[model samples]
Target: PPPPLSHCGRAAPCEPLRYNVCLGSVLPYGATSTLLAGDSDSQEEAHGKLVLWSGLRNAPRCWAVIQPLLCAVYMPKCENDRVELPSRTLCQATRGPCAIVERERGWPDFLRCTPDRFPEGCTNEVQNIKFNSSGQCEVPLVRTDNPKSWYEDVEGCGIQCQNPLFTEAEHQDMHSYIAAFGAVTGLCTLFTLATFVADWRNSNRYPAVILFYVNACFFVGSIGWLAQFMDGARREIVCRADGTMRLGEPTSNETLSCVIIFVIVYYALMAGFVWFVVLTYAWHTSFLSGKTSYFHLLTWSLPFVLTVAILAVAQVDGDSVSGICFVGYKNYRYRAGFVLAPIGLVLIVGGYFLIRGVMTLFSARRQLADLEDNWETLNDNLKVIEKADNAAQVKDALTKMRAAALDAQKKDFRHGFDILVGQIDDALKLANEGKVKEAQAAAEQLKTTRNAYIQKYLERARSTLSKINETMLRLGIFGFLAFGFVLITFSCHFYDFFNQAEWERSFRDYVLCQANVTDCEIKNRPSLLVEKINLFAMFGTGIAMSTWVWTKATLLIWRRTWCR
Candidate 1:
């Protein structure tokens, strides 16, 4: 440590500063050896100037040359045993611009170019700093050795990974494709749910009842997308300081809305897949009994478990396109393991149950054909008894027909056939006496049964089977899409890994650009590998399913309206 000097003067050694306060090559500007600026103003005084000045590094007036000016005065250059003050021109040059800031903010007048101390004459060696203000910042690639170490794009950053070639203005709308994409998915899915609610009393409307639940999961999951879309242009709604997705609130700011949104996104998104599996399981257990309570069990418990595990692992990441917190934006392994791998397994299980459902349809075809022929025989035999005056003779004669009806009933009744069979017993038993009108009444009731059988039973069965076939096709499409998302994310992660040097370099430039938003060099975007397919897979799959549900629902409503 150097001895305490009385006030500012003469030859002394200088201490180099840490932090972004100063830059560039050094020169002789001295005082005392180990010259801590000794008692020169103490460490606190020198540091206070740095702290106060840096706060205005982006001020409108003199920000361009503030750092170099501050460096010049306190530690002016020394050459021939005399302190060379800064040009004398720079201090006068900065006064008008910088003084406006201090005077308005009500600071004490500490700076003055007294000129009396500069009897040794001023030197013009330290010119003002050259900070580029070319309206566009075009920085060269600065590769870092380690992939893990990254550059920042200010606090609460997202994929500023924008393309320098394309106009950055267009990005705010390129993102609108996703906003529009989400609108269709969420709104269409909502239309389906509301339409189902409107006609929910169609008691045996099995597909639609289960259908409402699946779309509800999707509809709720999309709330965050809508939440994220409103958070201004090119700024992130939920991300870390380093550009990863936030787990909980990363900072204790007023951004819990994003935290709430991600819970809906992750939890409900996982629930939708579980519902898909349950729907197929509901199909699989056609002959066996399964309950709605079990459906709640899988959809509720397991998603919570998985969600906690992911949060614990810190695998959440931000997306520029999606604009929401998600499972894997950067890390590939967790993207596959946490999402793709688990989803692929669920698809396999669902596909197995789906196949089981179609197999049972084969056996029902034979029972249907035989049951139809028997109904015709029973109806004709009843007509013979009705028209005859002496019903007893024909009653005994129709016993063989009743026997045939009994034969089909023993094979399969499907419950609806029970009413028709009961009508047969009533007509034949009353015909034991010679009651003509009684036989006629029973035949008409049986005619009512036959009409309902043809209208609601046979046609309903055919339509139900048609929907089953369609369900299989839909699940097939969805399964492939789920994996399509996986594969797309897989390739994106590897591409990032392979070109990490390139990725890191651009990230550095993003750091440079964001340090001063008003004067960015150019623009940056995510690798093209990440752009198209990711939006296509996640958003495209959801929108496709919602469109299907929406189309069917609108058609159903339209048909009902036309008939009414």
Candidate 2:
């Protein structure tokens, strides 16, 4: 079994030799056992050639051929006590309840020329032999010519060992689960974004605008995850002309699938986190200050630029076994400079502003309460000082009190209202003298003053409420958005962490060895049930904490205090 001549290219001069047998040359074969004999010299050469061929196929291939023959080699399981031997057996032996079949050029054997063997090199030996019974057989062939080392409890003739990161069942199950989770998250983000957009249209609030973009980020990111589940890298087995198989080389297309989707997800996540920062800034400024253009530029431009820069500068690759598609782990600059550092800064700065903004909410609520209390106290004091005993005097005192309230509002520059109040006051005094004409005039003036004050107070109350509501709206919306980002960030890191050990193992054993050499065992690695437990640990903690904080902030902003 010399190495397959396919390994020797058309341009290469030398061919592999096994015990002086040139693999480049063809071996004569026929249909009957009489054509096969074990001459000591020919037997030794064939045995030596088989050993050398086995060793060569066992070595990992430098280049994986895409030919259809190699593709068929990976189709069936060949790792057991005995397995099928290589297809290029030199001679056939019809004996011992087994047949050894061999190929000679492109011509078919026609009863084998009365089953003849080449007179010069014919031997009573079988190249590839197998037992008749079917079982998990590793070494399908036993060399009768060289029995010394051929039958010493040996495994499969040409079979190799395999170790998979996950069993087939586990791979399919996990892939489905992850894809479902991503789809759900994506739907939630889409709905949330739509709600934010609607709110913005109705209220024209800056915080709502920020949240809109925030949800959009998560939406795109979730889609990326879904795409990963759908199109992650898969291993392809290739067979050489010698009937040996190897893992296919990752094509440029496969590499692009990994890098492109991940880049999209990365950019979306970074943009979402930055928007949280912007919303916090808007809240801290009471929605009245901060540079609008700066936020717009940063929120839209920074992530795009970061993605481009990292993809251009960092190493990117495809991974099949661990089911991960992303930037190469070795590229710390992509993770640090483009992702981790930016988000870390946003977290710190945004958290600070968030706390301050929340405190400002309470402060504004207290201030609004104080304004109401002052108005009530001033009116009560006016009533005690201007107390009246008779109907006419009571009316007169009411007029004076109304005049004083108008004067209090004079600081707001309502001079016309002040003049109107003074005329009503004088008319009411005259009416107190029992002048019917003056009394009617005074009545009409009081009605005018009442309508004017009603309009004034309504406008004033709405103005103050708008300021307080502005802050509250920012807090509530931004709090919810911040919670989403925290959840998204947690999901990304948690997924990476969950797969870290598997990734390292698969990388070393599967990818580096070209999928042939792996020490992975399904039993040794975590099972599907264990994986579920890990998923709960990561998602439960992150979702629970973020949800709690978001609900608390929302209640505080819109339900508990001045907002009510």
Best by TM-score: 1
C-alpha lDDT (0 to 100) for residue 377 of candidate 1 = 74
lDDT of 2 by residue, 439-511 (tens): 4445456456545654466457547667655446746564655545554554464455556566556434443
Q: List the lowest-lDDT window of 10 residues for candidate 1.
A: 134-143
* Cα lDDT tens digits for candidate 1, 1-564: 343222234455444433323333354333312222222364446556555655554333454455555556544444334444444466566665466455556433334544643222443334534544212222221222222322331111222333333445555666677677678878778876766665666622444455567778878877766776664522455544333334334234335444456678878777877876776676655431246667778888898998877767766655555567667555656666776665667657766766666567565665667766776777677667666667775676457566876677562335656676677778777777777678667777867766866346556555655664665455545444544554564465455555655554665565555544325543444555365565565565566555545545467775785676
Every model's TM-score: 0.49, 0.46
**Stretches of candidate 1 above 4 Å error?**
1-167, 203-207, 231-236, 239-249, 286-289, 313-315, 330-334, 352-530, 547-564
> With candidate 1 superimposed using the best TM-score fit, by how many Å does residue 535's alpha carbon deviate from the native?
3.1
How big is the positional error of residue 349 in model 1, measured in Å on the Cα after superposition?
Answer: 2.9
**Model 2 global lDDT (CA atoms, 0 to 1):** 0.44
> Per-model C-alpha lDDT, please?
0.56, 0.44
Question: What TM-score would candidate 2 get against the native?
Answer: 0.46
